[PDB]
């Protein structure tokens, strides 16, 4: 007890918050601050030195800077990937059975059903790269959801995580590469790839560095990376040969029949009336994704649920369809 | 409507006003009333009033049951003796008589210990049989034998709903919330209604729980009368314990009507279907013997390659990869590699003699001792391999029949209430050799022979091993593995007072108090006895750092069924022994992602005993995500036990006592490598 309450002199009044740079095997690490003060002192208790992940903020002192402990602190990492197993499988959507068996056969052959993968002796640990014109997570997460059935998943949505802060660099990509290293049986999913589409000079070099580290120049077959953008013209031609090397496919235009199937899947569990017609619903829409029709199915199930009924009438589903007609036109 | 015309009608206490006013209350009693029966303050005078007094009792219990009462509701009905699919009978009978007779049976069941409550229970039984709402009137009439005539009075045509629903949730809440004797009523009455009905395999589970000799007879003359066959012989031999297969083969050898139940009663017809069908439809890759047989060195990873080699029993290449592989191996590896030929030859009985004979009566004592161990492992019903190990039996210091006593007495315990094996085991335990595994495989042998016996006999067998257990207080490992067999004899029942008999004649210095707490471990297979759960939390903080490991290790055996309560805050503590308690308390179940998380947190540790103990249950609970933990151990290690144990985790990766004894004997690996010579002969694997 006294030995635990005797180191209080170091963590007392002379205490500061610095930024550690790296850990040296010589048990004296190098720290930094606003002016970059480098002090090396033998380590003490209360530190982990393994999960510390150097390059973050640590605890310093006004003294010779003997490290008395560490203090953890990133909320943006939590919203990166989902850790749940959704019930949406590859057999819940139709029409694109070949388009979904191309990626299912592409990334479900490594690490699962390995007699057609390891006996050949190829191992292209790069994965396919797709793009959905509607996107909005619906089509790209409806194609990536096939791997989410029974497997660990890794999700990355939007290039905002790089642009919402100062140019720290590819260190976040190194964090995804070390959590993917410790989570090798996973699927890397990069969504909403609009880095160059949205300083600007650093975005190109952290994107080309993203291409460098994504290529896997020192790592063996560890994880399958599946990228997903919205516009194929935004990506530069240099991100192709070191990037998409396995296979790519095209997605058809969802005008009437793909929206009829999306409407059937979004209206398979719910109960609708007999007078609910389909031609006006697949006619009034124009280049719409599944998030807004899911939004009007949610507010239509709740609005029809206001009368303590689960049946969605035709006039109430047109009244909810006015949200679709207005939202895309606003 | 308004109470203007009918409100001044209940105030007159005259007999005609009641005999005509009350029938109007029975007419308007279809929905009770227009309100919550606020007329209590006016009918409380009718309470004192009495021609049609049974109607006044009916309306009185109607209103008292309508607003509130704890005891005064069923009195007008126990005194009424009711004699005078609509909404009326549904309201006044279903819910009002449901809670009414429920609180009457509860108050009369807890207060006093005549037949009026039986007439109410049969009347409500019939009326709710008309109501046809199952599991609710049932789930209420569970606690009131009367349940036998209730089931045989109800189980006539509704078999799927009462059997599936009533037996499912009433069996689950009957091992969870119901004590033992009413569960025995479930077993006997379920033997009745299920004996008169179909679905024999659930009655065979009722034989896994009853362990009665009549059930197998009636189900073999009835299963024989009702015409696959080898499959029900397979799980027939799997569900049966050590007692009723020996007794089954002696009663079928007593009848000898067809001898097909004699053929199915042994290990031959449970293995002749599996082995060819397994070799045919499945094709295991050769990169596991070719690689896992190549990255081995240091004379220990090669032992892990003898165990992975023992996994085969399709491909028998690593088995037949020339000779001198056992000659290069040391004693710790001559016994294990000598038993490898026994692990790889579980089938091919006739070939086992011509495969092991090359190593029999050899020059090295451990080659032929482990060869007799192999002869004991390869078979369990042939009994024609024991003789050239039972013959000599006479060393008294060391004459190769002590090691042949290890392999042959252990393998004979695996493949043995046989009297003329224990009449010869008397000088075995009485020998008292300095070798630990003598009394180890002796107590485990007679212990596995005495599992499921006649309520755990306390005869001079376990009395003899207790007296000779307390003979000398040296080499406390004897005191660690003799309670193994002691508990194997105490196993099979919880309510027995024999654990308190051990608390009488056993209690001593904490050595035999650890023996007594092991008897406490194996003498509590499981029931509704939460008293030992709060007692478990009470004695959980004992200073002795081993009775915590075993007495708290019992968690995986006590609550083995209700796995939702098994995860607790044992990992949040600071004692490494508790981390071992949870780490072993995980088990060998289907391995959900929560368990894989508990091994993702328990895996990263610095002690070689816990890092050695984690891959055992990690890879036992998962037999996609199989190679990730192996890569994790490759990243942690790259000691010897971690590498041999992670190759053994490559072995493990890709309610019977046979699946409970081996690892419970394996709970003492934190010692010399002599225990690791008994590690290679486990039988709990599938």
Coordinates of N, CA and C in Angstrom, one line a residue, chain B residues 489-577:
Chain B
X489 N -16.7 -42.4 -8.0 CA -17.6 -43.2 -7.3 C -18.8 -42.4 -6.7
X490 N -18.5 -41.2 -6.2 CA -19.5 -40.4 -5.7 C -20.4 -39.7 -6.8
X491 N -19.9 -39.7 -8.0 CA -20.6 -39.1 -9.1 C -21.9 -39.9 -9.4
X492 N -22.8 -39.2 -10.0 CA -24.1 -39.7 -10.4 C -25.3 -39.4 -9.6
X493 N -25.1 -38.7 -8.4 CA -26.2 -38.3 -7.6 C -25.7 -37.1 -6.7
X494 N -26.7 -36.2 -6.4 CA -26.4 -35.0 -5.6 C -26.9 -35.0 -4.2
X495 N -28.1 -35.6 -4.0 CA -28.8 -35.6 -2.7 C -28.2 -36.5 -1.7
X496 N -27.3 -37.5 -2.1 CA -26.7 -38.4 -1.2 C -26.0 -37.7 -0.1
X497 N -26.0 -38.4 1.1 CA -25.4 -37.8 2.3 C -24.0 -38.4 2.4
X498 N -23.6 -39.2 1.4 CA -22.3 -39.8 1.4 C -21.2 -38.8 1.4
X499 N -21.4 -37.6 0.8 CA -20.5 -36.5 1.0 C -20.3 -36.0 2.4
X500 N -21.4 -36.1 3.2 CA -21.3 -35.8 4.6 C -20.7 -36.9 5.4
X501 N -20.8 -38.2 4.9 CA -20.0 -39.3 5.4 C -18.5 -39.1 5.2
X502 N -18.1 -38.6 4.1 CA -16.8 -38.1 3.8 C -16.4 -37.0 4.7
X503 N -17.4 -36.1 5.0 CA -17.2 -35.0 6.0 C -17.0 -35.6 7.4
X504 N -17.4 -36.8 7.6 CA -17.3 -37.5 9.0 C -15.9 -38.2 9.1
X505 N -15.6 -39.1 8.2 CA -14.5 -39.9 8.3 C -13.3 -39.4 7.5
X506 N -13.4 -38.3 6.8 CA -12.3 -37.8 5.9 C -11.7 -36.5 6.5
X507 N -12.5 -35.6 7.1 CA -12.0 -34.3 7.5 C -10.7 -34.4 8.3
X508 N -9.7 -33.7 7.9 CA -8.4 -33.7 8.5 C -7.7 -32.4 8.1
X509 N -6.3 -32.4 8.2 CA -5.5 -31.4 7.6 C -5.9 -31.1 6.2
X510 N -5.7 -29.8 5.6 CA -6.3 -29.4 4.4 C -6.0 -30.3 3.2
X511 N -5.2 -31.3 3.3 CA -5.0 -32.3 2.2 C -6.3 -33.1 2.0
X512 N -6.7 -33.8 3.1 CA -8.0 -34.6 3.0 C -9.2 -33.7 3.1
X513 N -9.0 -32.4 3.5 CA -10.1 -31.4 3.3 C -10.2 -31.0 1.8
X514 N -9.1 -31.0 1.1 CA -9.2 -30.9 -0.4 C -9.8 -32.1 -1.0
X515 N -9.5 -33.3 -0.4 CA -10.2 -34.5 -0.8 C -11.7 -34.4 -0.6
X516 N -12.1 -33.8 0.6 CA -13.5 -33.7 0.9 C -14.2 -32.7 0.0
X517 N -13.4 -31.6 -0.4 CA -14.0 -30.7 -1.4 C -14.0 -31.2 -2.8
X518 N -13.2 -32.2 -3.1 CA -13.3 -32.9 -4.4 C -14.6 -33.8 -4.4
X519 N -14.8 -34.5 -3.3 CA -16.0 -35.2 -3.1 C -17.2 -34.2 -3.2
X520 N -17.0 -33.0 -2.7 CA -18.1 -32.0 -2.9 C -18.2 -31.6 -4.3
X521 N -17.1 -31.6 -5.1 CA -17.2 -31.3 -6.5 C -18.0 -32.3 -7.3
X522 N -17.6 -33.6 -7.2 CA -18.2 -34.7 -8.0 C -19.5 -35.2 -7.4
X523 N -19.8 -34.9 -6.2 CA -21.1 -35.3 -5.5 C -22.2 -34.4 -5.8
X524 N -22.1 -33.4 -6.6 CA -23.1 -32.4 -6.9 C -23.3 -32.2 -8.4
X525 N -23.5 -33.3 -9.1 CA -23.6 -33.3 -10.6 C -24.6 -32.2 -11.1
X526 N -25.6 -31.9 -10.3 CA -26.5 -30.8 -10.6 C -27.9 -30.9 -10.4
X527 N -28.5 -30.0 -9.7 CA -30.0 -29.9 -9.5 C -30.3 -28.5 -9.1
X528 N -31.5 -28.2 -8.6 CA -31.8 -26.9 -8.1 C -31.4 -26.8 -6.6
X529 N -30.2 -26.3 -6.4 CA -29.6 -26.3 -5.1 C -28.7 -25.1 -4.9
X530 N -29.3 -23.9 -5.2 CA -28.7 -22.6 -5.2 C -28.0 -22.3 -3.8
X531 N -28.4 -23.1 -2.8 CA -27.7 -23.0 -1.5 C -26.2 -23.2 -1.7
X532 N -25.8 -24.2 -2.5 CA -24.4 -24.3 -2.8 C -23.9 -23.3 -3.8
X533 N -24.7 -22.5 -4.4 CA -24.2 -21.4 -5.2 C -23.9 -20.2 -4.3
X534 N -24.7 -19.8 -3.3 CA -24.4 -18.8 -2.4 C -23.3 -19.3 -1.4
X535 N -23.3 -20.6 -1.1 CA -22.2 -21.2 -0.4 C -20.9 -21.2 -1.2
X536 N -21.1 -21.4 -2.5 CA -20.0 -21.3 -3.4 C -19.4 -19.9 -3.4
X537 N -20.2 -18.9 -3.4 CA -19.7 -17.5 -3.3 C -19.1 -17.2 -1.9
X538 N -19.6 -17.9 -0.9 CA -19.1 -17.7 0.4 C -17.7 -18.3 0.6
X539 N -17.5 -19.6 0.2 CA -16.3 -20.3 0.4 C -15.4 -20.0 -0.8
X540 N -15.8 -19.1 -1.7 CA -15.0 -18.8 -2.9 C -13.7 -18.1 -2.5
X541 N -13.7 -17.4 -1.4 CA -12.6 -16.6 -1.0 C -11.7 -17.3 0.0
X542 N -11.6 -18.6 -0.1 CA -10.7 -19.4 0.9 C -9.2 -19.2 0.6
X543 N -8.4 -19.2 1.6 CA -7.0 -19.0 1.5 C -6.3 -20.1 0.7
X544 N -6.8 -21.3 0.8 CA -6.2 -22.4 0.1 C -6.5 -22.2 -1.4
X545 N -5.4 -22.1 -2.2 CA -5.4 -21.7 -3.6 C -5.6 -22.9 -4.5
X546 N -6.1 -24.1 -4.0 CA -6.4 -25.2 -4.9 C -7.9 -25.6 -4.8
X547 N -8.5 -25.6 -3.6 CA -9.9 -25.9 -3.4 C -10.7 -24.8 -4.1
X548 N -10.1 -23.6 -4.3 CA -10.8 -22.6 -5.1 C -10.8 -23.1 -6.6
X549 N -9.7 -23.7 -7.0 CA -9.6 -24.1 -8.4 C -10.5 -25.3 -8.7
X550 N -10.6 -26.2 -7.8 CA -11.5 -27.4 -8.1 C -12.9 -27.1 -7.6
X551 N -13.1 -26.7 -6.4 CA -14.4 -26.4 -5.9 C -15.1 -25.3 -6.7
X552 N -14.4 -24.3 -7.2 CA -14.9 -23.3 -8.1 C -14.9 -23.8 -9.5
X553 N -14.0 -24.8 -9.8 CA -14.0 -25.4 -11.2 C -15.3 -26.3 -11.4
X554 N -15.9 -26.7 -10.3 CA -17.2 -27.4 -10.5 C -18.3 -26.7 -11.2
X555 N -18.1 -25.4 -11.4 CA -19.1 -24.6 -12.1 C -19.5 -25.1 -13.4
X556 N -18.6 -25.6 -14.2 CA -18.9 -26.2 -15.5 C -19.7 -27.5 -15.4
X557 N -19.7 -28.1 -14.3 CA -20.4 -29.4 -14.1 C -21.8 -29.1 -13.5
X558 N -21.9 -28.1 -12.6 CA -23.1 -27.9 -11.8 C -24.2 -27.3 -12.8
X559 N -23.8 -26.1 -13.4 CA -24.7 -25.4 -14.2 C -24.5 -25.6 -15.7
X560 N -24.1 -26.9 -16.1 CA -23.7 -27.2 -17.4 C -24.8 -27.0 -18.4
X561 N -26.1 -27.0 -18.0 CA -27.2 -26.8 -18.9 C -27.6 -25.4 -19.1
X562 N -27.9 -24.7 -18.0 CA -28.2 -23.2 -18.1 C -26.9 -22.5 -18.3
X563 N -26.5 -22.3 -19.5 CA -25.2 -21.6 -19.9 C -25.3 -20.1 -19.9
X564 N -26.5 -19.5 -19.6 CA -26.6 -18.1 -19.6 C -26.1 -17.5 -18.3
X565 N -26.1 -18.2 -17.2 CA -25.6 -17.8 -15.9 C -24.2 -18.1 -15.7
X566 N -23.6 -19.0 -16.5 CA -22.2 -19.4 -16.4 C -21.2 -18.3 -16.5
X567 N -21.4 -17.4 -17.5 CA -20.4 -16.3 -17.6 C -20.7 -15.3 -16.4
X568 N -19.6 -15.0 -15.7 CA -19.6 -14.1 -14.6 C -18.4 -13.2 -14.6
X569 N -18.2 -12.5 -13.5 CA -17.0 -11.6 -13.4 C -15.8 -12.2 -12.8
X570 N -15.6 -13.5 -13.1 CA -14.4 -14.2 -12.6 C -13.1 -13.7 -13.3
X571 N -13.2 -13.3 -14.5 CA -12.1 -12.7 -15.2 C -11.7 -11.3 -14.7
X572 N -12.7 -10.6 -14.1 CA -12.4 -9.2 -13.6 C -11.7 -9.2 -12.3
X573 N -11.4 -10.4 -11.7 CA -10.7 -10.5 -10.4 C -9.2 -10.3 -10.6
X574 N -8.4 -10.5 -9.6 CA -7.0 -10.3 -9.7 C -6.2 -11.6 -9.4
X575 N -6.9 -12.6 -8.9 CA -6.2 -13.9 -8.7 C -6.1 -14.7 -9.9
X576 N -4.9 -15.2 -10.3 CA -4.7 -15.9 -11.5 C -5.4 -17.3 -11.4
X577 N -5.5 -17.8 -10.2 CA -6.3 -19.1 -10.0 C -7.7 -18.9 -10.4

